[PDB]
Amino acid sequence: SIPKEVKVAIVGAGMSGLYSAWRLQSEANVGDLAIFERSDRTGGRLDSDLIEFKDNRAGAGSTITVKEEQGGMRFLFEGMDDLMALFLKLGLEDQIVPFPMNSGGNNRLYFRGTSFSVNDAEQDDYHIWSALYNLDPSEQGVNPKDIINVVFNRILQVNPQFDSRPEVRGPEFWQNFRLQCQWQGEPLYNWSLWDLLTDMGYSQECITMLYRVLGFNGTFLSKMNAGVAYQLLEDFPADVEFRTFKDGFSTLPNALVDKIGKDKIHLQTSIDSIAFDKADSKYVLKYTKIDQSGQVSEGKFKAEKVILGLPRLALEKLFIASDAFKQLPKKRRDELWDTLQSTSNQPLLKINLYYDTAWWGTGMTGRPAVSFGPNFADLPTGSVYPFYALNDELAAALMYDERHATPNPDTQHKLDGIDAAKYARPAALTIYCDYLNINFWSALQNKGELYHHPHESELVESIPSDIFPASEAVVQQATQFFKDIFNTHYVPQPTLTSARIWEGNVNFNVPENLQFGFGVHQWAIGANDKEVIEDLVEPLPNLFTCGEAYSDYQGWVEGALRSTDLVLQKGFGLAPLSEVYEQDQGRSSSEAIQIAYRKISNKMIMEYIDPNFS
Amino acid sequence: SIPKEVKVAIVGAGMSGLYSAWRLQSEANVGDLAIFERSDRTGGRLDSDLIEFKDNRAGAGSTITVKEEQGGMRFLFEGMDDLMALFLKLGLEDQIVPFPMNSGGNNRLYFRGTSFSVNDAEQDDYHIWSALYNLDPSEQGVNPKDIINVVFNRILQVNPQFDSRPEVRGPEFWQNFRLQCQWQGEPLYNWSLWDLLTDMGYSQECITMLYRVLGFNGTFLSKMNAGVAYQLLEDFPADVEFRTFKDGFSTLPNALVDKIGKDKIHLQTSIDSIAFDKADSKYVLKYTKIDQSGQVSEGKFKAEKVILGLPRLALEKLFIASDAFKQLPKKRRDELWDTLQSTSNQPLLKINLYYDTAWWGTGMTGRPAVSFGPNFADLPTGSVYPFYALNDELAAALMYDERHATPNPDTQHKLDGIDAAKYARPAALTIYCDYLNINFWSALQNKGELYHHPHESELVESIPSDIFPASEAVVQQATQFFKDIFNTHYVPQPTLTSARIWEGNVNFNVPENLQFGFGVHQWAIGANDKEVIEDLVEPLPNLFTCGEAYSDYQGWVEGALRSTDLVLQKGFGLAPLSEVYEQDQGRSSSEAIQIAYRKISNKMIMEYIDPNFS
Numbered sequence A, B: 001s002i003p004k005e006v007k008v009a010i011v012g013a014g015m016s017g018l019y020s021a022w023r024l025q026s027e028a029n030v031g032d033l034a035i036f037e038r039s040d041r042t043g044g045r046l047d048s049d050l051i052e053f054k055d056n057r058a059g060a061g062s063t064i065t066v067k068e069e070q071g072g073m074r075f076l077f078e079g080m081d082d083l084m085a086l087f088l089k090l091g092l093e094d095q096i097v098p099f100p101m102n103s104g105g106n107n108r109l110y111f112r113g114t115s116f117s118v119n120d121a122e123q124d125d126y127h128i129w130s131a132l133y134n135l136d137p138s139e140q141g142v143n144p145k146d147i148i149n150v151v152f153n154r155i156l157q158v159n160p161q162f163d164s165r166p167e168v169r170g171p172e173f174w175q176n177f178r179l180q181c182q183w184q185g186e187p188l189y190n191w192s193l194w195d196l197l198t199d200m201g202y203s204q205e206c207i208t209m210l211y212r213v214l215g216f217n218g219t220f221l222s223k224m225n226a227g228v229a230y231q232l233l234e235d236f237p238a239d240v241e242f243r244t245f246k247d248g249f250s251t252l253p254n255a256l257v258d259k260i261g262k263d264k265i266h267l268q269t270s271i272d273s274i275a276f277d278k279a280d281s282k283y284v285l286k287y288t289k290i291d292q293s294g295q296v297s298e299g300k301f302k303a304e305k306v307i308l309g310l311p312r313l314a315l316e317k318l319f320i321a322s323d324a325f326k327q328l329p330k331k332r333r334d335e336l337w338d339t340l341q342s343t344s345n346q347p348l349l350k351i352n353l354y355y356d357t358a359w360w361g362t363g364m365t366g367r368p369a370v371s372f373g374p375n376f377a378d379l380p381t382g383s384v385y386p387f388y389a390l391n392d393e394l395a396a397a398l399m400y401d402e403r404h405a406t407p408n409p410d411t412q413h414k415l416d417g418i419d420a421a422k423y424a425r426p427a428a429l430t431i432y433c434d435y436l437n438i439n440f441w442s443a444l445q446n447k448g449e450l451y452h453h454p455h456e457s458e459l460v461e462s463i464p465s466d467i468f469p470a471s472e473a474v475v476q477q478a479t480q481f482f483k484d485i486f487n488t489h490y491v492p493q494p495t496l497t498s499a500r501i502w503e504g505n506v507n508f509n510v511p512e513n514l515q516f517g518f519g520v521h522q523w524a525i526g527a528n529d530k531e532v533i534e535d536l537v538e539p540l541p542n543l544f545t546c547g548e549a550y551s552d553y554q555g556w557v558e559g560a561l562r563s564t565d566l567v568l569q570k571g572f573g574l575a576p577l578s579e580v581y582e583q584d585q586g587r588s589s590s591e592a593i594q595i596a597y598r599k600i601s602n603k604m605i606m607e608y609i610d611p612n613f614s
């Protein structure tokens, strides 16, 4: 049942769509809204998986849960005040769990046919990098990642007009940085990073090292401008304490869905086009719906206000097919289209391979054990992240670890046993790559038969619906690369796999369960994103756009939430959530979230690690 | 003056547009046609330049001509029977001139921070490649280009069903090869080359070597399928005798324009959209024209038949905006759009830097002199081609050279003097790159002020209109790379520059003199190009498409001519030009063109080189 008129119609059940409805329902008393989502699931580019593997250990119908991510995975307590506030208001802070990013130096590196570890790379004044890359002398004997840091310091040094001092560096800093800082008279958003480093005098060998060693070469090789690329590159300092949700980032959209109500969300309902009814001053939304049989249905309805929570490629399709846009004057319709072109589409992929046990610990490799964080490579792999079966004791050990406490031998010995025990429980690896590496996996994933371990139903009885298997060719090649990266002869066959390629499609011959938007977005060269962002709040009267694609904080949910807030302000009077939080609570969401988390971490550690802890 | 009705309306004054009109006028007696071309020039992706530099030598108002290319540059006597026939029928064979591809081993190579020569690369069982790349043992001690050749032989070996024997290997061979040959059960057009080599067991180091060393990494990293990539990679054997026109490839479109008549060609006239008139069974073409003042004008006219000689991106724009397409049923309109998606857009660029004299000869470098052919590099340069001032004696020396004659000391000594004298006359370098390297130059060319040598009008009085200067940033970086590639401290400032980036635009904020289509196209993965090609001849009744993008021979003018021929056959009864030639002349265009050229080469050599020649 689809209503025939609504106060607010919400296109997109991703984060910005779900977030608009919750805030309008609860803070603006608007109850006659509806969300329309083309796919058969809510959450968009957030998509966690919970697999319940048959516990087939020796002394075991017992079940073991592994959380994995097909989309978004991590967040931070600083710089995401809207997201923190959103977590606190939904009471989801008790589920917050560490997301660690290193293995004390044992994370892997594979570059130019050579497998080694992070600790290895540091030896002898970072010698290995000088042996693999034909570096200029000024480029030798330093950690590659510190070259990005130094160049940032140099950009800040020659831009004293730009304040450069707020200890917490949020989206305003990064907007001003890319819009106000210059290099040699040209502001950074007119620069490509590749051009920038080159003009700074770096070798092409050095630039290739950097974009391979950071794992996400889009920052250098795509059309994104240099300013926004730095925002992304300085999002992962050495000392990052990322966090995540125990049951996966989907916890947050599902939690919003409980509060919205399944009855106002209309899945498998694509909004095909939008027209304006001059008579009763209403929008008219043509749609296409698939029921629970597969029986299609074209229909139409009205709405006083429209909210498009949609990324760039979705927004161009509607614009193309919508009379509300086509009947605009030549000048502004062309200007609006050109404005959609101002953020670059960034392809991303994640392929998850699950295993009954993990094979990258010292017991299986004979080498120092790999635990957590990106294993980078110049192979099509890009980066590889390990994921372990959910375990309360392990999360407390991780929680102890993000305190830089000095354990006594008793506690070091218990942390030892915990670090090792996880390799005996099921686990997973995510291959996570961007720009240059996409086409390698693309062609591989679409060729040949799909991968299924035999007696698969014996290994998992309930395979989630958002899981499309990796192709046999994808598993085959991914397995050779793992042997390379982890320097081991032994990489067994996965029990279960999923492949997800966030790269937007314009082909009508693709099932809906395989249509996915561009993984992330970043501002192109020449883009004045301050003008672009404000133009796209309400481009036609009572028609709004918002979401991550044209946001202040591209790449992150906070981008979507801050973009939506502009719509909720301009169209509905609502102040930014973080500001609403602070008036209501008397402290920031930052301080609240840190205090709440320290408490449950304090309790977790004492309960599991060191009964006599600080 | 634009007619209000025509028998045939031709959209696009590129090669396929101009070729349709000439053949319809002359062979089908159709005189009431008109060509409509959005830009202010004919010829499309053919675009030669003739610069007339002030001869400021010591013993000189004398003029020196340099030919250069912003688009297409070379062709072959075998495998391009339509093009040869077209040359013979227009009497352009007397202007055919060698296009040499090597310097006897002195062409440059720059890979991983190391500058060296082709002769150097051969030393010690191709050792240099093993020192620069971490190759598998089976990948060591062989010439990189011979790895592509061997893999081709292997593909042919395991496909004995595929005949694999015609000595002249034309578009049919390459269509059957990519459509009928398989690797491990999957046919090559379902494969990416990158996936293919990997599955064959090659290292990523080796694959990176290959795609850097061949200069056009699109074959490996883009979405083009493996079969069509091989067609391109085996277009440049070691023994290639390419040829070109003395005054540039534009000779051919200009020669067609003389025969069509400027009066039937309507420049600065974009066809915006197309509708069907059910009443008088006519198409209705909305257009936009700019007169000689800049005064725009929107109009409309009719035509009984429409011929779209347009590449993919142009074809999608019309399809989007045209009622003749939108009023098609849901199924076929979506099927037709999906069919447009089946050829991949391949960006290309050419930046030409002209110099008063050439600086890469031994007199200026102290190293073995560079003459002709690609200087490849893993720098954003890609490939660099030298171009010299037009000189009849030099072309005869080149003509002698494509005979593998053994000159006597008298003739070797005269060839010596000729080889060296060209460095004293003006010359040019073309940077010619694809896929991965485009974005480097893109962002550079659009940033900052444009390059002009001071007292430029003193150096060239008549700067052609199709020449947009290289940006100052482009010249600056291109000059550093030249010092790298040519291993010299000394690369002076260019007298004149041009930049051309064949990468299709969808932004309305770009002048017409800067809108250019995708440089070339190649079949994507999954594309059954036999079905696609025949579907796009006449997709609606009396509406035809043709050109290179969805052709049998992508990359080359012959592709455009063979694609058009299908339209001229199905819509107008005309047999393929090469077949028309043969009936009329009693021999192929291949044999005619070889015999005609041998004669004028025979005469050229005797006149300039060795009076007593074979």
Ligand SMILES: Cc1cc2nc3c(=O)[nH]c(=O)nc-3n(C[C@H](O)[C@H](O)[C@H](O)COP(=O)(O)OP(=O)(O)OC[C@H]3O[C@@H](n4cnc5c(N)ncnc54)[C@H](O)[C@@H]3O)c2cc1C
Pocket: A011, A012, A013, A014, A015, A016, A017, A036, A037, A038, A039, A042, A043, A044, A045, A046, A070, A071, A072, A073, A074, A075, A269, A270, A271, A272, A309, A310, A311, A314, A348, A349, A350, A502, A517, A518, A519, A520, A546, A547, A548, A549, A555, A556, A557, A558, A559, A560
């Ligand atoms: C691989 C990957 C990893 C990431 N990791 C992180 C991370 O660690 N941390 C972080 O903060 N962020 C991360 N992100 C980013 C985060 O996922 C996004 O910023 C955010 O979830 C996107 O929200 P959105 O509402 O802007 O868009 P979307 O999530 O893309 O929502 C758009 C929705 O609209 C629907 N839709 C489209 N067209 C129509 C139509 N015509 N009618 C109806 N519905 C339509 C789509 O199906 C989709 O559900 C990651 C993204 C990717 C791809």
Ligand SMILES: Cc1cc2nc3c(=O)[nH]c(=O)nc-3n(C[C@H](O)[C@H](O)[C@H](O)COP(=O)(O)OP(=O)(O)OC[C@H]3O[C@@H](n4cnc5c(N)ncnc54)[C@H](O)[C@@H]3O)c2cc1C
Pocket: B011, B012, B013, B014, B015, B016, B017, B036, B037, B038, B039, B042, B043, B044, B045, B046, B070, B071, B072, B073, B074, B075, B269, B270, B271, B272, B309, B310, B311, B314, B348, B349, B350, B502, B517, B518, B519, B520, B546, B547, B548, B549, B555, B556, B557, B558, B559, B560
């Ligand atoms: C860098 C480069 C080098 C090349 N080198 C070679 C080579 O050495 N040898 C070789 O054989 N080939 C070469 N080619 C390929 C060759 O240039 C092309 O195959 C051929 O010239 C293209 O002809 P076409 O008619 O298919 O398309 P185009 O040349 O692209 O013609 C399309 C024309 O239609 C016009 N147009 C577009 N939309 C509209 C509209 N709406 N209304 C009116 N007019 C419109 C465009 O302005 C253009 O003039 C090269 C190409 C490039 C880019």
Ligand SMILES: N[C@@H](Cc1c[nH]c2ccccc12)C(=O)O
Pocket: A072, A073, A074, A216, A218, A232, A346, A434, A520, A521, A554, A555, A556
């Ligand atoms: N938050 C993202 C990082 C990211 C944002 N935008 C991107 C663009 C390209 C590559 C990575 C990113 C992640 O967890 O991975």
Ligand SMILES: N[C@@H](Cc1c[nH]c2ccccc12)C(=O)O
Pocket: B072, B073, B074, B216, B218, B232, B346, B434, B520, B521, B554, B555, B556
């Ligand atoms: N004929 C083209 C070669 C070519 C055709 N298609 C291509 C695609 C990519 C790179 C090169 C090509 C040339 O002279 O350069």
